[PDB]
Design a binder for these strands. Structure first.
Lengths: 117, 142, 110, 47, 103, 150, 37, 56
RNA sequence: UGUAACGGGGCUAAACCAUGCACCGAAGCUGCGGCAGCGACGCUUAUGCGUUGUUGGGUAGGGGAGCGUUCUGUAAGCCUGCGAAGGUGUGCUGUGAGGCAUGCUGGAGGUAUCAGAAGUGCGAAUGCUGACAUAAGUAACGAUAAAGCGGGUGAAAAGCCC
RNA sequence: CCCGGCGAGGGGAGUGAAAAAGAACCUGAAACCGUGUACGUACAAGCAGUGGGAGCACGCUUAGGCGUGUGACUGCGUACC
């Protein structure tokens, strides 16, 4: 029972090359380079599902720090204030209020300064 | 939902005029770098130029502490081989003082296309007057 | 109405022909013939014969009126190479790729 | 019912196939380590 | 009028009539849930939490669709050491729709 | 492989990979690496495992009503028409007739029918008791089967 | 042409010449080796 | 003396960006014969600047 | 080779020392959702759960469980010219190898399920064979004895004929 | 029948169920080379992706603010064996 291996090899190669559309040059044409490109894209994608949590958090902290200094207190003192005021709003939402609702953020700063004093 | 991103078509950005007489170079420079990034605005976004236009004036009257007036040396290399060219702080204030504030701020701003676009918003003058009366820069006391 | 002429297996590599094809692409046909008459290439002779054949196929096999025609498409595919041998020094040989091409002129009035 | 007969459970064990891939467990060196006389075809010392 | 409430693991800022994609709740498809742990209600007057969750506030949300999210490939390649491991993952979600926010 | 043991190029100095035979299994036209030989595929079945297996399959042909016991089963003339009509009357299409004394006329009558196979009680095998839908044993064949399988 | 190309690839497969790389290519490898010693 | 990485087709077309042929650019019309020719050259019928020359 | 012994700007504190309270900070810990292994335990008994504890980086290597390919039986059955295999897209799906459906090309074969046997899975071997690139329209066009013009033939003449 | 050098090659016509079944002939993959369209790209440095992400172009869509293509700018990131 000789098994020719054309049809299944074609299917594997094609699977990998479909996962590499949009890559520059051989990275999207040649199998032997698109295999490495697809794997290295896999490793980066893993690594960056962790980094997007780190990057979004540092973005939010920069926005709360900006808006809170606009209301006359730093980020450090603001988070200490709200923790002592026993407010448990996470900082995705504090960043989002700090962009969209300036008056609510002003009131949060008043709770923070009220408890912090 | 998703975190808000500033859109560079719709970023409103203001004009500020800052008098640099007797300010410390690094401390002014760091405040300008913060305002030109847009770090002072709640709509800050790291890939969008959200900052303001700052008109620094009286750049020749900026101050430094210690012996940095004579010992702080600005090196650059010209590309030709033995092209290491130094100039102290007072030589730079005599020749072009705009280069003093602009070197400082430029080294505090992120390197890359965006931070070049951020530095295009800094306008420094060695004197007390500027051409930009049409843009109505309000006096940023810092 | 699109009307095609082709020279399949033209002894000239496709690069050398594509210079000339890139000249007349998009032109009106009488202007394209005036360009190929005064281009000093071997490829301009080949391209001119395909273009004249396409005007004739247009006016005979289709609707007439040469003066409305335009060279809408022109492209030069690569044909099969003739694999020959150049005798080099010290006893070694090379393959010479005597290259052909496939000229296509699609002419149309619209 | 010749397509419903079936062996016992545990009687037909698979069979090690060496040299196929990374997932299989026995690829590249087939389970015989790095160089040496024992990782060589025919290789091994006598009894 | 929006409201911030705590949900599965994390927090959501939601107005009324807005579809939210939460973690997998153990609720039937057309059934209505209540989040009794709202952290902020803002209408034109803010109401938030000295001690956390607001005393008088609740969010009534109708479950819309259980589902299973986009596949992600998990690739674990250790260069030059003869190890790679791929895996896949589709996270379960629950789309609810906010029926109402009661301050 | 029909070739020569001449080494195709010098061991060192061509930039080619080193090769020693034109009949290598890596080379086109080269000789299978582990080329097959004619082999025997017979398995030993112990006698008590063969008889045990026949006892199990006969017990399941009885239990699934796939075993029909007739007293006599013979055809008049050696005609496939007569056996076709006879099996049609007994509601049997796919059938293993097994008879303790092999009739000649029955054997010639079942030789063209595809689904039908006539055996003597001696030569039954597991794959035919399992293969055919119904097994029709003559009573004499039942007695001979019990003598075989003890 | 194909037959002449297979035989004329088969030209320096059994060579001997040591000062010429691969039988034919001129070099300075005699002086390189000799100076390395 | 020889390359060390195969150049792309990008760099190949970039190099050929200048290999383009220029058109004629407009060829002039004879005064008498009214037919077309390269400028400063004689026509196919063998006229030049409206007078008859060669005549082969 | 160029500042070139703070990463850099720059700093007279943005340095050092002492004290203190904040905040940032990892794939650590926690929260929420999911999967798998090994125990324990009341049933379910031929195993799944209300559970419950705990574990899951991995090379050589050991153990366990699978997917696909070609061929044999099931199969004179079941799909198939109302369109097979193959080819090329899209959509859905599984933890994965993969599977399923379907548009276009194709034009006649394919094969469930459950077993059986393997020429059973390639990116590497200066691997073998074919094809096609690259340098590149680049070097070269083979003695530095040398050509010029008129006419002819021809679709076309530096090279043919006179 | 027409272009063409009484060519090569082609375009029609005709046969054929089908001539992108035309003798360079079943299927007709990939590398490789083109033509057309959408987007990006001429002040910007590096395994060319990945996380974020504006804008633009096509389809939707009872505007539901989605999908596909592209991808300015930005964090991180020195191939495989």
């Amino acid at each position: 029972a000789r098994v020719k291996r054309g049809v299944i090899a074609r299917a594997r190669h094609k699977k990998i090359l479909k996962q590499a559309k949009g890559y520059y040059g051989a990275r999207s044409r040649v199998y032997r380079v698109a295999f490495q490109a697809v794997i290295k894209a896999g490793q980066y994608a893993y690594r960056d599902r962790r980094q997007r949590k780190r990057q979004f958090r540092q973005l939010w902290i920069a926005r709360i720090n900006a808006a809170a200094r606009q209301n006359g207190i730093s980020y450090s003192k603001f988070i200490n204030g709200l923790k002592k005021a026993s407010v448990e709003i996470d900082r995705k939402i504090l960043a989002d209020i700090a962009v969209f609702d300036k008056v609510a953020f002003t009131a949060l700063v008043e709770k923070a300064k009220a408890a912090l004093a | 939902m998703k975190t808000f991103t500033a859109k560079p078509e719709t970023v409103k950005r203001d004009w500020y005029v800052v008098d640099a007489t007797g300010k410390t170079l690094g401390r002014l420079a760091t405040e300008l770098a913060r305002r030109l990034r847009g770090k002072h605005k709640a709509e800050y976004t790291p890939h969008v130029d959200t900052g303001d236009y700052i008109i620094v004036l009286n750049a020749d009257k900026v101050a430094v502490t210690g012996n940095k007036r004579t010992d702080k040396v600005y090196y650059h290399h010209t590309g030709h081989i033995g092209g290491i060219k130094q100039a102290t702080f007072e030589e730079m204030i005599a020749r072009r003082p705009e280069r003093v504030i602009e070197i400082a701020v430029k080294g505090m701003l992120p390197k890359g296309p965006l931070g070049r676009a951020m530095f295009r918003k800094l306008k420094v003058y060695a004197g007390n007057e500027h051409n930009h009366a049409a843009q109505q820069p309000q006096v940023l006391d810092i | 109405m699109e009307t095609i002429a082709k020279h399949r297996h033209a002894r000239s590599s496709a690069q050398k022909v594509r210079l000339v094809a890139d000249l007349i692409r998009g032109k009106k046909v009488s202007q394209a013939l005036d360009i190929l008459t005064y281009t000093n290439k071997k490829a301009a002779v080949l391209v001119k014969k395909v273009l004249e054949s396409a005007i004739a196929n247009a006016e005979h096999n289709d609707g007439a009126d040469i003066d409305d025609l335009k060279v809408t498409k022109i492209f030069v595919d690569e044909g099969p190479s003739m694999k020959r041998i150049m005798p080099r020094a010290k006893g070694r040989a090379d393959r010479i790729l005597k290259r052909t091409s496939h000229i296509t002129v699609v002419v149309s009035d619209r | 019912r010749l397509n419903t007969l079936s062996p016992a459970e545990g009687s037909k064990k698979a069979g090690k196939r060496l040299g196929r891939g990374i997932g299989s467990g026995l690829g590249k060196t087939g389970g015989r380590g790095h160089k040496g006389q024992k990782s060589r075809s025919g290789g091994g010392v006598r009894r | 009028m929006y409201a911030v409430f705590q949900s599965g693991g994390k927090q959501h800022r939601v107005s009324e009539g807005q579809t939210v994609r939460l973690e997998k709740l153990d609720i039937a498809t057309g059934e209505t849930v209540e989040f009794a742990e709202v952290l902020m209600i803002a209408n034109g007057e803010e109401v938030k939490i000295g001690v956390p969750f607001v005393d008088g506030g609740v969010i009534k949300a109708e479950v819309v669709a259980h589902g299973r999210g986009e596949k992600v490939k998990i690739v674990k390649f250790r260069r030059r050491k003869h190890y790679r491991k791929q895996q896949g993952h589709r996270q379960w979600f629950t789309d609810v729709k906010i029926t109402g926010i009661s301050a | 492989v029909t070739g020569s043991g001449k080494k195709p190029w010098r061991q060192k100095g061509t930039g080619r990979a080193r090769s020693g035979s034109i009949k290598s299994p890596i080379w086109r036209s080269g000789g299978v690496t582990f080329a097959a030989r004619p082999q025997d595929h017979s398995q030993k079945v112990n006698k008590k495992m063969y008889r045990g297996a026949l006892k199990s399959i006969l017990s399941e042909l009885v239990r699934q009503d796939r075993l029909i016991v007739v007293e006599k089963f013979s055809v008049e003339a050696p005609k496939t028409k007569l056996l076709a009509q006879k099996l049609k009357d007994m509601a049997l299409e796919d059938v293993l007739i097994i008879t303790g004394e092999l009739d000649e006329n029955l054997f010639l009558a079942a030789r063209n029918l595809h689904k039908v196979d006539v055996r003597d009680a001696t030569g039954i095998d597991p794959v035919s008791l399992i293969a055919f839908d119904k097994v029709v044993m003559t009573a004499d064949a039942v007695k001979q089967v019990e003598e075989m399988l003890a | 042409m194909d037959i002449n190309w297979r035989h004329n690839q088969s030209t320096f497969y059994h060579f001997t010449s040591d000062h010429r790389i691969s039988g034919w290519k001129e070099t300075n490898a005699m002086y390189v080796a000799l100076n390395s010693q | 003396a020889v390359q060390q990485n195969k150049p792309t087709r990008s760099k190949r077309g970039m190099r050929r960006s200048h290999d383009a042929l220029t058109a004629v650019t407009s060829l002039s019309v004879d005064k008498t014969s009214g037919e077309k020719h390269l400028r400063h050259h004689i026509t196919a019928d063998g006229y030049y600047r409206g007078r008859k020359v060669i005549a082969k």
